[PDB]
């Protein structure tokens, strides 16, 4: 009744081909805006695609996220900084990307200003989070 | 107590130079960005450069770039617009101003300096 | 290159009227517009940042929105004081570009 599951979903989530198949995101996410970064002047069509793409796996991680918070439970999962940062990371990833890419007409209600750094920090915590997995 | 006082401008020859400067109070120039605008007689506002010193990271419009360069001295808090070959179409109020960072709003503006070149 | 085109030019109103002023930005900058007043012989003032986030001690009266790349500074009640050129300003792209301006009068 619940500690089931969230053992089955860990049976699923400590794996070697889940555990390195969401590292392969990571590097895929990271080429992916270099050459978005690197194509001059796209279209907005080619843009979306670009920016869909930063999205799709934004969100991925994020569900990934979603299921290492519940399966070690809230409480236990907390407490490692190591874990907390990542997590951190993730979310404040996915929330520049997705008013990057989906909300971006409902920004100002944000009453955010500095958007272009948000947004170069959002692209820095990509690669942050690779120096979390070369510890190990 | 943010203050720009800004100096330096006057009567120069095209073909001529100045050099104009900011003093920075109340917040420091190396962690900030710093803005030159400038104004014609009766007309609107036009970016002329940006230094966020933090980033190594000055900015010009095309309409000055070569001619005109920005700096700053953090221990003086203080910055700097070098301005050679100046023309005609140069002449305006120039002001300092400044914003949090690079892309934030520039949120203070100096009264200015006046640069009239002319023979 | 970002061209902000603004709207009217001048204009002319009564104290306590509600008056508008239109920007509209070439292609889209996200809400990285600002509004500034100048008064005559005296250095532009930042009323808004972020399209509609009022600026610290600004009178309440000035208020930004926008919708798309069209951005609006609505004067709510217009006071005596308010005379003053007003000029939205990109900030998204380089370089920094401003509107024409718009002059408003006071009309008495």
């Known amino acids: 009744g619940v500690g089931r599951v969230q053992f089955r979903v860990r049976a699923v989530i400590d794996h070697l081909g889940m555990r390195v198949f969401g590292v392969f995101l990571i590097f895929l996410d990271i080429i992916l805006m270099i050459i978005d970064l690197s194509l001059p002047g796209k279209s907005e069509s080619s843009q979306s695609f670009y920016d869909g793409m930063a999205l799709a796996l934004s969100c991925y991680f994020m569900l990934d996220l979603g299921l290492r918070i519940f399966a070690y439970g809230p409480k236990n999962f907390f407490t490692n900084p190591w874990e907390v940062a990542d997590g951190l990371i993730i979310v404040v990833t996915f929330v520049v990307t997705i008013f990057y890419t989906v909300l971006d007409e409902y920004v100002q209600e944000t009453g955010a200003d500095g958007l272009g750094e948000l947004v170069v920090l959002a692209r820095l915590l990509r690669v942050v989070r690779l120096a979390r997995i070369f510890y190990s | 107590e943010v203050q720009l006082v800004e100096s330096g401008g006057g009567l120069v020859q095209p073909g001529g130079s100045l050099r104009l400067s900011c003093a920075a109070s109340g917040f420091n120039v190396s962690s900030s960005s710093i803005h030159w605008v400038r104004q014609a007689p009766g007309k609107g506002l036009e970016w002329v450069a940006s230094?966020?010193?933090?980033?190594?990271?000055?900015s010009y419009a095309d309409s000055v770039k070569g001619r005109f360069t920005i700096s700053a001295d953090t221990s003086k808090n203080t910055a700097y617009l070098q301005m050679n070959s100046l023309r005609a179409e140069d002449t305006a109020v120039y002001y300092c101003?400044?914003?949090?960072?690079?892309?934030?709003?520039?949120?203070?503006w100096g009264q200015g300096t006046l640069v009239t070149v002319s023979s | 290159d970002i061209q902000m085109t603004q709207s009217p030019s001048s204009l002319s109103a009564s104290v306590g009227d509600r008056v508008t002023i239109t920007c509209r930005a070439s292609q889209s900058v996200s809400s990285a517009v600002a509004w500034y007043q100048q008064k005559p012989g005296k250095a532009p003032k930042l009323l808004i940042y972020?399209?509609?986030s009022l600026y610290s001690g600004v009178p309440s009266r000035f208020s930004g929105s926008g919708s798309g790349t069209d951005f609006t500074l609505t004067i709510s009640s217009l006071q005596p004081e308010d005379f003053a050129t007003y000029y939205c300003?990109?900030?998204?792209?380089?370089?920094?570009?401003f509107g024409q301006g718009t002059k408003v009068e006071i009309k008495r």
């Open positions: 972020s399209a509609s």
């Open positions: 300003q990109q900030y998204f792209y380089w370089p920094i570009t």
């Open positions: 230094i966020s010193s933090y980033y190594g990271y000055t």
């Open positions: 101003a400044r914003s949090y960072s690079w892309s934030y709003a520039i949120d203070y």
